[PDB]
Symmetry: D3
Subunit: 157 residues, 6 copies
Amino acid sequence: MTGAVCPGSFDPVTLGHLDVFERAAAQFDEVIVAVLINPNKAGMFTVDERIEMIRESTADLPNLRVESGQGLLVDFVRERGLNAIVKGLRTGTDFEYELQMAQMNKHIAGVDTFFVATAPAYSFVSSSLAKEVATYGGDVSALLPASVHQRLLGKLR
Amino acid sequence: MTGAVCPGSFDPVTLGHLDVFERAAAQFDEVIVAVLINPNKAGMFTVDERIEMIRESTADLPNLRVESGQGLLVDFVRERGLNAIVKGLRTGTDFEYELQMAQMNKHIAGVDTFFVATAPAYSFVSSSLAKEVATYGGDVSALLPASVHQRLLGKLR
Amino acid sequence: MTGAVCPGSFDPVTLGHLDVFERAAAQFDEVIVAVLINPAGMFTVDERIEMIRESTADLPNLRVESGQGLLVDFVRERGLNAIVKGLRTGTDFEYELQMAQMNKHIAGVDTFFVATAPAYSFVSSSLAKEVATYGGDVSALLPASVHQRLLGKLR
Amino acid sequence: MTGAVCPGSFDPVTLGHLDVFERAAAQFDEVIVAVLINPAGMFTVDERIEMIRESTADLPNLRVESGQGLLVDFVRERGLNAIVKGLRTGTDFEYELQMAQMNKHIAGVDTFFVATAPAYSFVSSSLAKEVATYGGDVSALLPASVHQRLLGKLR
Amino acid sequence: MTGAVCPGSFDPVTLGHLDVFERAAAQFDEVIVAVLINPNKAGMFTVDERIEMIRESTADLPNLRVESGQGLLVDFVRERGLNAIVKGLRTGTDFEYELQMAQMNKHIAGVDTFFVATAPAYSFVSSSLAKEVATYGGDVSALLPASVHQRLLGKLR
Amino acid sequence: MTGAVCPGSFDPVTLGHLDVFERAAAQFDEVIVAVLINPNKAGMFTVDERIEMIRESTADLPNLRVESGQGLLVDFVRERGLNAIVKGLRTGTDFEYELQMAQMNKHIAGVDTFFVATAPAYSFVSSSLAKEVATYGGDVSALLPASVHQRLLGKLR
Ligand SMILES: O=C(O)c1ccc2cc(F)ccc2c1
Ligand SMILES: O=C(O)c1ccc2cc(F)ccc2c1
Ligand SMILES: O=C(O)c1ccc2cc(F)ccc2c1
Ligand SMILES: O=C(O)c1ccc2cc(F)ccc2c1
């Protein structure tokens, strides 16, 4: 009955993201991870690579599935008969641009956004910072799922 | 069966609170509003009065119930077979002390906390500020449930 | 002879901006909306000026002008030394705080900040354009004028 | 006939407050400093008024008055509907933001915020009192008047 | 030659504090932990108890010593021939009251303040929240040194 | 032997930077100012010009030296036998992205980061804003070292 969408670009997915997926899957009957693709800028990983990395590290979550999309998040959510977004947060500044988008999304489509505090251990990892650190040789193995780390190193090499 | 607890003192309940209750009730199978009884801090309304005002305001939410409690919030939550809290936010600053408490609550009892931004309309209302304004004759009727406003005028007479 | 300047790119002007214009117009004798030329956006400077002028017709003490370079030069060349800027968050206070203190330092121009009306608090020109581009209804967030004009740019 | 009110407890008035008074006086025709009666602090209301009056002698369009209850009633009973308040951080913006939006809602009174001068940015009445109490030199942070008066309260 | 003071009320010391002590001791020739006592309000622990709990959990830091004081921090620092304070931080809001005091302290005494980000694992523990959680029975054993936890439980009982 | 690295692009160095350098040099036995060379982002001054401007401004700091570098900052730091970074702050917002980077840097290489609030006088100056103001003829001479200001007028002519 109940359900939420967990959106992001997940390029690549991090252990911070996985933490949020797990907590959403524990509290909602179904969870859809929404991999948002910009048709005008390729990330590091193709859509199929992003989805596979997420599937491989969520195999123990039976009520979670992964789908890509583009355009308005709230269209993705409503077309699936849902009206909740779950998003991970780190700081009060993350709460400002995110609050703006959450209130816009409620205004235009009646979709609710629930924020959850990331786990402390994973709180400083972001996809962008992990990529940037890995590019210049820093060790980010503890911040990313096994499904990701060596594929990341391969892309950089 | 999914479920969440919405905690507060609600002295009195505001439309900001009600907005959070409605969004919780829309997304979880069961919601419990947990009204804090504080042996010391005695506010304007008794616990029974506060429960009654919440029940009037939430009469159209069949999957939401109101109960009072004391002590550790995560004990209240786990005693009812739940492991989620839903709390309303207004600022990035409220994210800071609330983030600390959410991480603590996860650590000591494995209870998740989901934050939701209250509607823009009700974002500057708080129980304490509504009482203060009403005390000096300002009009806060657009910010409180109808029944609450009526009761609040009584306590001031 | 009090007065203030309300700066921005206004591409396009939103109800959030208009709210700030109205409050500045109510508290200062003279208000000048300063439209940045900085080529690059969706609307030309002329179109942006036109849309602001259409939306502020009931504000007799407001006028709209374009400019570039330092805002403080715009302000002082018109005999004024106050800027009025609308806010939303504590984050916006921070980068805006830096510029306000720089502007005070280099030109003695004061900056007054005003909180956005709660209803218009999540709208920005960029977010409104983005949502409208993907078909979301932003008609409640923009002056009637502007909204029809935006639909024109997209179709 | 523009005007604004600058509220506070001013126990005592600091150079940070005076900076804000001067900026408000420069941009509005009429400025009223509103001194909260709320008994409880170090200086009596009369003494606080006196110290502000001493420090603003060169501001012809400023006056000082006491009051209690709702600030918006103070403001509107004097025919005005603007508050000018000085800031320091994004945190202060947040609790002040809540009150500004409430005040707008209940009485239609606008609040304009101004950034503290960098030099006066870490001084507050409470911190100045605390430091002075333990013998720290706060003479650069307070009007000359006030500083001598504070030394008197401590000895 | 070089030295810093690490101040606080440490009532009681937490693992977050210890992390800061260890990092300061690694970067300065000498570190003084300054236990600040309010002569007009007793905390949970007496000054001697606070000092003993800190000494017991800093025994592997040979260049650290612990002293109590009151009044102006900058007097404590300067009377020891030092002019640096090291303080742990958690958030940007912690940076606001702390920035005010750091700039005041530089103004009145020329003392510098260096802030260090707490370790993620210890980021949500504070003395006050640990005491509050422990009072109502929550498990805070992982957030406090061994020198503290059972002494805390004893005070509460 | 204690020591810290003060990183930046310094294009050009400001009095805000200099204030940080002086406080670092006063508290550590050795300070290294690390000037970023970016293969892409070519600013207004060459790396050699930036190093020379910093050296003029820091002529009275005998325990401070200036060097350029590329890639991962923690590699630069550890290659020089150090494990501390000193960075200047202005806001709570700057605490947020910098906090993330400090926790990352500690995690991947065990390098500590110490933050210091710049003097109130120099708290609104930044290299980018100084250049922008100077470009349009505004006077930023009170915000930059004398030599820098002279050089900056040259690049604009
Ligand atoms: O909102 C709160 O802080 C709070 C905390 C603990 C509580 C415990 C209860 F049993 C009931 C309500 C509660 C609210
Ligand atoms: O939006 C701004 O920051 C901005 C900056 C500079 C400006 C200069 C002008 F002449 C006019 C508007 C201006 C707006
Ligand atoms: O400092 C304040 O928030 C404050 C509040 C209410 C006031 C009412 C008055 F009549 C005068 C000053 C006042 C200041
Ligand atoms: O300030 C920075 O972001 C930065 C980062 C990395 C660096 C690496 C170096 F080798 C030298 C300076 C550096 C500055």
